Short mmCIF file of C-alpha atoms and ligand atoms in Angstrom, two decimals:
data_model
loop_
_atom_site.label_atom_id
_atom_site.label_comp_id
_atom_site.label_asym_id
_atom_site.label_seq_id
_atom_site.Cartn_x
_atom_site.Cartn_y
_atom_site.Cartn_z
CA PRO A 11 -289.32 96.66 80.09
CA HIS A 12 -288.22 93.01 80.15
CA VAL A 13 -285.52 91.28 78.09
CA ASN A 14 -284.29 87.68 78.06
CA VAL A 15 -280.54 87.03 77.79
CA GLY A 16 -278.11 84.19 78.37
CA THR A 17 -274.47 83.10 78.18
CA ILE A 18 -273.51 80.53 75.54
CA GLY A 19 -270.13 79.01 74.85
CA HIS A 20 -267.72 76.16 75.53
CA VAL A 21 -267.84 74.36 78.86
CA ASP A 22 -265.41 75.53 81.59
CA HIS A 23 -265.09 78.88 79.78
CA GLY A 24 -266.78 80.69 82.66
CA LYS A 25 -270.42 81.08 81.66
CA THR A 26 -271.70 80.52 85.21
CA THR A 27 -268.93 82.66 86.71
CA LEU A 28 -269.76 85.46 84.28
CA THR A 29 -273.48 85.21 85.05
CA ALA A 30 -272.61 85.64 88.72
CA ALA A 31 -270.38 88.55 87.67
CA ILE A 32 -273.24 90.45 86.02
CA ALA A 33 -275.46 89.57 88.99
CA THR A 34 -273.02 91.09 91.49
CA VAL A 35 -272.20 94.14 89.35
CA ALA A 36 -275.89 94.87 88.73
CA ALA A 37 -276.25 94.59 92.51
CA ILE A 38 -274.70 98.07 92.42
CA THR A 39 -277.65 100.43 93.02
CA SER A 40 -279.47 97.26 94.24
CA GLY A 41 -280.53 96.44 90.68
CA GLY A 42 -279.31 92.89 91.20
CA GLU A 43 -278.01 90.74 94.06
CA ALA A 44 -274.53 89.60 95.02
CA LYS A 45 -274.93 86.06 93.72
CA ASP A 46 -273.01 83.00 94.89
CA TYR A 47 -271.45 80.81 92.20
CA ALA A 48 -272.61 77.52 93.72
CA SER A 49 -276.29 78.50 93.99
CA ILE A 50 -276.43 79.30 90.27
CA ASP A 51 -274.32 76.29 89.28
CA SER A 52 -276.90 74.11 91.09
CA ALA A 53 -279.54 74.56 88.42
CA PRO A 54 -282.88 72.86 89.20
CA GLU A 55 -284.32 70.35 86.74
CA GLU A 56 -287.82 70.83 85.32
CA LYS A 57 -289.42 68.07 83.24
CA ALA A 58 -291.71 70.42 81.32
CA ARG A 59 -293.71 68.98 78.40
CA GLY A 60 -291.99 65.62 78.83
CA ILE A 61 -288.58 67.28 78.40
CA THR A 62 -286.12 67.64 81.28
CA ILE A 63 -283.84 70.69 81.40
CA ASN A 64 -281.29 72.02 83.87
CA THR A 65 -281.62 75.81 83.73
CA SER A 66 -280.53 78.51 86.19
CA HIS A 67 -282.90 81.48 85.90
CA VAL A 68 -280.95 84.54 87.03
CA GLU A 69 -282.83 87.83 87.26
CA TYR A 70 -281.65 91.43 87.54
CA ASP A 71 -282.55 94.88 86.26
CA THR A 72 -280.84 98.07 85.12
CA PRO A 73 -282.00 101.69 84.77
CA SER A 74 -282.87 100.66 81.19
CA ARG A 75 -284.95 97.50 81.70
CA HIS A 76 -285.17 94.22 83.58
CA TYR A 77 -283.23 91.19 82.32
CA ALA A 78 -284.01 87.49 82.53
CA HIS A 79 -280.64 85.73 82.44
CA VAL A 80 -280.40 82.06 81.48
CA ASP A 81 -277.58 79.63 82.31
CA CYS A 82 -277.22 75.91 81.65
CA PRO A 83 -274.68 73.51 83.18
CA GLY A 84 -274.02 71.55 80.00
CA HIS A 85 -274.27 71.36 76.24
CA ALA A 86 -277.30 69.08 76.27
CA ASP A 87 -279.04 71.45 78.68
CA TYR A 88 -278.26 74.43 76.45
CA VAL A 89 -279.52 72.62 73.34
CA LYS A 90 -282.71 71.53 75.10
CA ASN A 91 -283.33 75.03 76.43
CA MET A 92 -282.90 76.67 73.01
CA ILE A 93 -285.03 74.17 71.13
CA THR A 94 -287.88 73.81 73.64
CA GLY A 95 -287.82 77.59 74.07
CA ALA A 96 -288.38 77.77 77.82
CA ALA A 97 -287.57 81.47 77.42
CA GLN A 98 -286.64 82.85 74.00
CA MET A 99 -283.39 84.79 74.25
CA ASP A 100 -283.34 87.86 72.02
CA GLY A 101 -279.72 88.42 73.07
CA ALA A 102 -276.87 86.00 73.74
CA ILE A 103 -273.62 86.76 75.57
CA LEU A 104 -271.14 84.50 73.79
CA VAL A 105 -268.61 83.59 76.49
CA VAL A 106 -265.20 83.04 74.87
CA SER A 107 -262.20 82.02 76.94
CA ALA A 108 -259.20 84.26 76.25
CA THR A 109 -257.31 81.06 75.40
CA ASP A 110 -258.75 78.20 73.31
CA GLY A 111 -261.71 80.28 72.18
CA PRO A 112 -263.27 78.62 69.12
CA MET A 113 -263.94 75.13 70.54
CA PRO A 114 -266.56 72.84 68.96
CA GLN A 115 -269.07 73.62 71.71
CA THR A 116 -268.99 77.29 70.69
CA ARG A 117 -268.98 76.15 67.05
CA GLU A 118 -272.28 74.32 67.48
CA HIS A 119 -273.70 76.90 69.91
CA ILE A 120 -273.46 79.74 67.39
CA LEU A 121 -275.09 77.57 64.71
CA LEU A 122 -277.80 76.53 67.17
CA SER A 123 -278.52 80.18 67.95
CA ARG A 124 -278.77 80.90 64.23
CA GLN A 125 -281.16 77.99 63.66
CA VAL A 126 -283.39 78.62 66.68
CA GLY A 127 -283.50 82.30 65.73
CA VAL A 128 -281.54 84.35 68.25
CA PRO A 129 -281.42 87.76 66.51
CA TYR A 130 -278.41 89.26 68.29
CA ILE A 131 -275.21 88.00 69.91
CA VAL A 132 -272.90 90.11 72.07
CA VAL A 133 -269.36 88.77 72.38
CA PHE A 134 -267.58 88.83 75.73
CA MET A 135 -264.25 87.13 76.34
CA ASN A 136 -263.09 86.11 79.82
CA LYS A 137 -259.97 84.50 81.35
CA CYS A 138 -258.04 87.59 80.19
CA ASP A 139 -256.47 87.55 83.65
CA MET A 140 -254.78 84.27 82.69
CA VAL A 141 -253.48 85.82 79.44
CA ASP A 142 -250.59 88.28 79.46
CA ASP A 143 -250.40 88.88 75.69
CA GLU A 144 -252.26 91.04 73.16
CA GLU A 145 -251.76 89.63 69.65
CA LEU A 146 -253.24 86.23 70.53
CA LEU A 147 -256.19 88.07 72.07
CA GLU A 148 -256.52 89.91 68.75
CA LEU A 149 -256.28 86.58 66.91
CA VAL A 150 -259.07 85.15 69.08
CA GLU A 151 -261.15 88.26 68.36
CA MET A 152 -260.58 87.81 64.63
CA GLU A 153 -261.50 84.12 64.88
CA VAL A 154 -264.77 84.79 66.70
CA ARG A 155 -265.63 87.62 64.29
CA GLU A 156 -265.07 85.30 61.32
CA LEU A 157 -267.09 82.53 62.97
CA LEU A 158 -269.99 84.92 63.57
CA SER A 159 -269.82 86.09 59.95
CA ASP A 160 -269.85 82.43 58.86
CA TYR A 161 -273.44 82.00 60.17
CA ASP A 162 -275.23 85.17 58.99
CA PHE A 163 -274.36 87.08 62.16
CA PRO A 164 -272.78 90.56 61.83
CA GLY A 165 -269.37 89.69 63.23
CA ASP A 166 -267.60 92.77 61.90
CA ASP A 167 -269.94 95.13 63.78
CA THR A 168 -270.48 92.73 66.69
CA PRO A 169 -269.50 94.39 70.00
CA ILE A 170 -266.64 92.55 71.70
CA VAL A 171 -265.76 93.38 75.31
CA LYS A 172 -262.89 91.93 77.31
CA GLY A 173 -262.62 91.11 80.99
CA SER A 174 -262.41 88.53 83.76
CA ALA A 175 -265.38 87.16 85.70
CA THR A 176 -263.21 86.18 88.68
CA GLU A 177 -261.88 89.74 88.93
CA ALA A 178 -265.45 91.03 88.59
CA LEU A 179 -266.50 88.87 91.54
CA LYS A 180 -263.37 89.85 93.49
CA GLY A 181 -264.07 93.57 93.18
CA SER A 182 -260.93 94.73 91.36
CA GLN A 183 -261.47 98.00 89.51
CA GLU A 184 -258.91 96.90 86.91
CA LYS A 185 -260.28 97.21 83.36
CA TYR A 186 -260.62 93.40 83.06
CA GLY A 187 -263.10 93.25 85.97
CA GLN A 188 -265.89 95.61 87.04
CA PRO A 189 -265.23 98.06 84.19
CA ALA A 190 -265.52 95.13 81.80
CA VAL A 191 -268.87 93.97 83.21
CA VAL A 192 -270.00 97.62 83.27
CA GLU A 193 -269.52 98.09 79.51
CA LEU A 194 -270.99 94.65 78.92
CA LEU A 195 -274.11 95.93 80.69
CA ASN A 196 -273.93 99.03 78.47
CA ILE A 197 -273.97 96.96 75.26
CA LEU A 198 -276.78 94.90 76.76
CA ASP A 199 -278.77 98.10 77.37
CA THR A 200 -277.95 99.71 74.00
CA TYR A 201 -277.23 97.19 71.22
CA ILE A 202 -280.17 94.88 72.03
CA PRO A 203 -283.38 96.46 70.68
CA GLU A 204 -286.50 96.33 72.80
CA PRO A 205 -288.32 93.11 71.82
CA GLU A 206 -291.74 93.32 70.23
CA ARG A 207 -294.73 92.77 72.50
CA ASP A 208 -297.24 90.00 71.95
CA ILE A 209 -299.96 92.64 71.64
CA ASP A 210 -297.72 94.49 69.17
CA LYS A 211 -297.10 91.47 66.92
CA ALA A 212 -299.42 90.68 64.04
CA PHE A 213 -302.68 89.14 65.21
CA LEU A 214 -302.73 85.35 65.43
CA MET A 215 -304.99 82.93 67.29
CA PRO A 216 -304.98 79.13 66.96
CA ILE A 217 -308.49 77.68 66.88
CA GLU A 218 -309.25 75.24 69.69
CA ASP A 219 -313.04 74.87 69.64
CA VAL A 220 -315.65 75.73 67.01
CA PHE A 221 -319.12 76.87 68.12
CA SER A 222 -322.22 78.23 66.43
CA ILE A 223 -324.80 80.63 67.87
CA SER A 224 -328.21 81.25 66.32
CA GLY A 225 -328.35 84.77 64.94
CA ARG A 226 -324.63 85.41 65.48
CA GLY A 227 -322.67 82.98 63.28
CA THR A 228 -319.60 80.82 63.86
CA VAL A 229 -317.60 81.21 67.08
CA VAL A 230 -314.05 79.87 67.35
CA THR A 231 -312.35 79.80 70.74
CA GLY A 232 -308.69 79.90 71.68
CA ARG A 233 -305.96 81.87 73.37
CA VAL A 234 -304.89 84.84 71.25
CA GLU A 235 -301.10 84.71 71.23
CA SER A 236 -300.37 87.94 69.35
CA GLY A 237 -301.92 91.22 68.27
CA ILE A 238 -305.51 92.34 68.81
CA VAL A 239 -308.80 91.33 67.21
CA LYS A 240 -311.74 93.74 67.06
CA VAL A 241 -315.17 93.81 65.43
CA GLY A 242 -314.70 94.84 61.82
CA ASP A 243 -311.18 93.39 61.56
CA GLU A 244 -310.56 91.49 58.34
CA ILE A 245 -309.21 88.05 59.27
CA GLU A 246 -308.34 84.87 57.39
CA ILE A 247 -308.45 81.18 58.31
CA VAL A 248 -305.18 79.38 57.56
CA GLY A 249 -304.26 75.77 58.21
CA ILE A 250 -305.54 72.29 57.34
CA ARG A 251 -307.76 73.55 54.53
CA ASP A 252 -307.08 76.24 51.94
CA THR A 253 -307.10 79.82 53.23
CA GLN A 254 -310.59 81.30 53.61
CA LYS A 255 -311.59 84.92 54.14
CA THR A 256 -314.00 86.14 56.81
CA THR A 257 -314.57 89.16 59.03
CA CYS A 258 -314.79 89.62 62.79
CA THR A 259 -318.32 90.36 64.02
CA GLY A 260 -317.79 90.05 67.77
CA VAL A 261 -315.37 89.04 70.53
CA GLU A 262 -316.90 87.54 73.67
CA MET A 263 -315.80 85.81 76.87
CA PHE A 264 -318.23 84.09 79.25
CA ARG A 265 -321.20 84.99 77.02
CA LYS A 266 -320.32 88.69 77.41
CA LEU A 267 -318.83 90.87 74.69
CA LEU A 268 -315.34 92.35 74.95
CA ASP A 269 -314.11 95.59 73.41
CA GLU A 270 -311.27 93.65 71.74
CA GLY A 271 -309.38 90.38 72.01
CA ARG A 272 -305.81 90.93 73.18
CA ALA A 273 -302.83 88.60 73.20
CA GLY A 274 -302.56 86.14 76.08
CA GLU A 275 -306.25 85.80 76.95
CA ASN A 276 -308.59 82.97 75.95
CA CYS A 277 -311.21 85.05 74.16
CA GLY A 278 -313.74 83.76 71.67
CA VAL A 279 -314.38 85.50 68.34
CA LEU A 280 -317.31 85.53 65.92
CA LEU A 281 -316.87 85.00 62.18
CA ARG A 282 -318.95 86.40 59.33
CA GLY A 283 -320.46 83.94 56.86
CA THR A 284 -318.28 80.93 57.64
CA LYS A 285 -320.09 77.72 58.59
CA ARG A 286 -319.56 75.43 61.57
CA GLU A 287 -317.95 72.77 59.34
CA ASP A 288 -315.86 75.18 57.25
CA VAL A 289 -313.41 75.57 60.15
CA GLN A 290 -311.86 73.15 62.62
CA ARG A 291 -309.35 72.83 65.43
CA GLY A 292 -305.76 73.28 64.29
CA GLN A 293 -306.37 76.16 61.90
CA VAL A 294 -305.34 79.63 63.03
CA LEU A 295 -306.87 83.07 62.71
CA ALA A 296 -304.38 85.60 61.39
CA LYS A 297 -304.16 89.03 59.83
CA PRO A 298 -304.51 88.52 56.05
CA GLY A 299 -301.09 87.71 54.61
CA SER A 300 -299.34 87.59 57.99
CA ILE A 301 -298.83 83.81 57.80
CA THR A 302 -298.98 81.16 55.08
CA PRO A 303 -299.48 77.38 55.18
CA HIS A 304 -296.73 74.95 54.27
CA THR A 305 -296.23 71.20 54.17
CA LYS A 306 -292.46 71.14 53.51
CA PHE A 307 -290.11 72.87 55.92
CA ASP A 308 -286.66 72.53 57.48
CA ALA A 309 -286.39 72.46 61.26
CA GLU A 310 -283.75 72.24 63.97
CA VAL A 311 -284.78 69.01 65.70
CA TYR A 312 -283.38 67.74 68.99
CA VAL A 313 -283.90 64.00 69.52
CA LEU A 314 -284.57 63.28 73.19
CA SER A 315 -282.33 60.64 74.69
CA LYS A 316 -283.87 57.87 76.80
CA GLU A 317 -282.97 59.85 79.94
CA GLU A 318 -285.70 62.46 79.26
CA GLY A 319 -288.28 59.75 78.64
CA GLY A 320 -287.26 60.08 75.02
CA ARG A 321 -286.98 57.01 72.83
CA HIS A 322 -284.94 53.82 72.65
CA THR A 323 -284.25 53.85 68.90
CA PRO A 324 -282.62 56.42 66.60
CA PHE A 325 -284.32 58.56 63.99
CA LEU A 326 -283.90 57.53 60.37
CA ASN A 327 -284.90 58.85 56.97
CA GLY A 328 -288.49 57.89 56.23
CA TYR A 329 -289.60 57.85 59.86
CA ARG A 330 -293.02 59.52 59.99
CA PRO A 331 -294.05 60.59 63.50
CA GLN A 332 -296.73 63.03 64.66
CA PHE A 333 -295.96 66.76 64.75
CA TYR A 334 -297.78 69.04 67.19
CA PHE A 335 -298.38 72.69 66.20
CA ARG A 336 -300.06 74.54 69.09
CA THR A 337 -303.49 72.88 68.78
CA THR A 338 -303.15 69.84 66.52
CA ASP A 339 -301.06 66.83 65.59
CA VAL A 340 -300.12 66.16 61.97
CA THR A 341 -298.19 63.27 60.46
CA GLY A 342 -294.91 64.38 58.91
CA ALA A 343 -292.24 62.28 57.22
CA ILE A 344 -288.69 62.90 58.41
CA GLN A 345 -286.39 63.71 55.49
CA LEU A 346 -282.70 63.87 56.34
CA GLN A 347 -280.00 65.32 54.07
CA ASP A 348 -277.05 63.66 52.34
CA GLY A 349 -274.79 61.82 54.77
CA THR A 350 -277.11 61.65 57.78
CA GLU A 351 -278.96 58.30 57.42
CA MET A 352 -278.60 57.51 61.13
CA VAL A 353 -279.58 60.18 63.68
CA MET A 354 -278.45 59.19 67.17
CA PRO A 355 -280.66 59.86 70.20
CA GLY A 356 -279.55 62.79 72.31
CA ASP A 357 -278.24 64.76 69.31
CA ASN A 358 -279.65 67.63 67.27
CA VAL A 359 -279.48 68.31 63.53
CA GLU A 360 -281.54 69.95 60.79
CA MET A 361 -284.06 67.80 58.92
CA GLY A 362 -286.70 68.40 56.30
CA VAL A 363 -290.31 67.53 57.10
CA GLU A 364 -293.25 66.90 54.77
CA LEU A 365 -296.62 67.13 56.51
CA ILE A 366 -299.68 65.27 55.27
CA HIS A 367 -301.67 68.52 55.14
CA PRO A 368 -300.57 72.16 55.45
CA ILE A 369 -300.12 73.86 58.82
CA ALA A 370 -299.89 77.61 59.30
CA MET A 371 -296.23 78.09 60.22
CA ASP A 372 -293.42 80.59 59.92
CA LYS A 373 -289.76 80.61 60.90
CA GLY A 374 -289.32 80.39 64.66
CA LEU A 375 -292.41 78.28 65.39
CA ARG A 376 -291.84 75.41 67.81
CA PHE A 377 -293.32 71.93 67.77
CA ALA A 378 -293.20 68.60 69.57
CA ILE A 379 -292.46 65.24 67.95
CA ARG A 380 -294.24 62.26 69.49
CA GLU A 381 -295.51 58.78 68.80
CA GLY A 382 -298.00 57.07 71.07
CA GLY A 383 -298.09 60.16 73.26
CA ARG A 384 -294.41 59.78 74.15
CA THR A 385 -292.26 62.77 73.23
CA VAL A 386 -289.39 61.55 71.05
CA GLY A 387 -287.94 64.96 70.24
CA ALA A 388 -288.43 68.70 70.00
CA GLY A 389 -287.94 71.08 67.11
CA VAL A 390 -288.15 74.62 65.79
CA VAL A 391 -288.92 75.76 62.26
CA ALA A 392 -285.90 77.20 60.46
CA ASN A 393 -287.18 77.48 56.86
CA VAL A 394 -290.46 76.95 55.01
CA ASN A 395 -290.84 75.80 51.40
CA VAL A 396 -293.64 75.37 48.88
CA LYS B 68 -249.09 82.55 60.69
CA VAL B 69 -252.81 82.43 61.45
CA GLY B 70 -253.38 79.59 59.00
CA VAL B 71 -250.42 77.60 60.32
CA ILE B 72 -251.64 78.07 63.90
CA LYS B 73 -255.15 76.96 62.92
CA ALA B 74 -253.81 73.88 61.12
CA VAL B 75 -251.61 72.95 64.10
CA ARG B 76 -254.53 73.41 66.50
CA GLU B 77 -256.78 71.23 64.34
CA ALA B 78 -254.05 68.59 64.11
CA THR B 79 -253.12 68.37 67.81
CA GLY B 80 -256.40 69.31 69.53
CA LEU B 81 -254.60 71.81 71.75
CA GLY B 82 -255.67 75.31 72.71
CA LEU B 83 -255.06 78.51 70.78
CA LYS B 84 -252.30 79.73 73.10
CA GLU B 85 -250.51 76.37 73.09
CA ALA B 86 -250.76 76.08 69.30
CA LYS B 87 -249.39 79.60 68.85
CA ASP B 88 -246.54 78.92 71.28
CA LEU B 89 -245.64 75.74 69.39
CA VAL B 90 -245.81 77.56 66.04
CA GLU B 91 -243.61 80.44 67.25
CA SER B 92 -241.17 78.03 68.93
N1 GDP C 1 -259.31 83.27 86.39
C1 GDP C 1 -260.57 83.14 85.92
N2 GDP C 1 -261.21 81.96 86.14
C2 GDP C 1 -262.48 81.78 85.69
C3 GDP C 1 -263.13 82.88 84.97
N3 GDP C 1 -264.36 82.45 84.64
C4 GDP C 1 -264.49 81.19 85.11
N4 GDP C 1 -263.37 80.78 85.74
C5 GDP C 1 -263.19 79.46 86.37
O1 GDP C 1 -263.64 78.44 85.47
C6 GDP C 1 -264.51 77.53 86.14
C7 GDP C 1 -265.62 77.04 85.22
O2 GDP C 1 -266.35 78.13 84.66
P1 GDP C 1 -267.95 78.04 84.67
O3 GDP C 1 -268.57 79.39 84.93
O4 GDP C 1 -268.39 77.05 85.72
O5 GDP C 1 -268.31 77.50 83.20
P2 GDP C 1 -269.69 76.73 82.92
O6 GDP C 1 -269.94 75.68 83.98
O7 GDP C 1 -269.61 76.05 81.58
O8 GDP C 1 -270.84 77.72 82.92
C8 GDP C 1 -265.07 78.29 87.33
O9 GDP C 1 -265.18 77.42 88.46
C9 GDP C 1 -264.08 79.40 87.60
O10 GDP C 1 -263.30 79.07 88.75
C10 GDP C 1 -262.36 84.13 84.77
O11 GDP C 1 -262.86 85.10 84.16
N5 GDP C 1 -261.12 84.17 85.26
MG1 MG C 2 -271.86 76.11 84.33
#
């Protein structure tokens, strides 16, 4: 199996050093590779979807499953990676320095994980080799537990493991080194449940092109991004218009029928009864009741600074840009909260959005904010309202 | 003790260990 993980926390707390530590320790039994610190600290920059991110993509595997490990060399890089969702992390290794643990970077990182929808956080504290005492370590543990509880995370039942990344790289068998990274791997292999597959999720398929075939009905094309669609499956059309019922009467690709339409492939699907003008690009096909349309929602929005292309001017309440949801752009009006009138570029906060017409969304969906074709920010849905 | 240490840390912007050392001193 495959799982995506990453180290979050305050700068200088040893996230990169710890990532190298797991790399080298997983290199035992050749599962990983002895990884140099500098190579991973030199994260390449990719300007994907008009957004530039420094991310170091570390990879390694265990007898349990393979891990995709994510590291960023700065707070802006971490925020961009979470919100643009280059690789959704279903598990986060909160790196806490044994001294000065709960810094504001960790403060905002935990909240960002909560908003973007990271389901599980595993706490690891490093720099224990610089700390000779025990009761301040316990105080730091209590602080991080309380902070996790403060943002809907378990906290009390959150596994906390203690060690030192420098000792792990050195090779010392002292409990704060290799043994520490070894348990940390154990919690990674046990506490983190196996993530759901795309083909195992509920069926969903955004509609990109609407056809019609004589004798067959209405054909809508698009890449199925979850579940499976088969002839005889009851499906519903959700999006711009009000939800309509239909039934699958055929799945075809290149004018040839398929046994079923699986997630990840650009299959076309036939609809029963629906007309060529009763459905349009932007709507999605979903299992009945799996998703619902909404115009008002609250999202974690990162405003691109001018350095990423971005935008010269700040966001403000009443700004109404275009919002892009997987196949379509829709005008939404930015609605800030009390005490947020000005929203500086390069920052990230939670805003409410009111779309001009409903879009099939649910918590965790990601979208781009643009005007004139220039990306001015990225976002992720954190709550939907009616 | 924990509350005093937290207040001192918030007031002086120092680390947890430094704040605790100042509080216990
Ligand atoms: N003694 C000790 N030093 C560490 C440890 N982890 C990190 N460091 C030092 O702290 C520096 C910064 O940590 P780093 O991994 O670069 O943090 P990041 O850049 O925010 O991901 C590194 O250059 C290490 O030398 C540790 O567990 N023990
Ligand atoms: Mg780093």
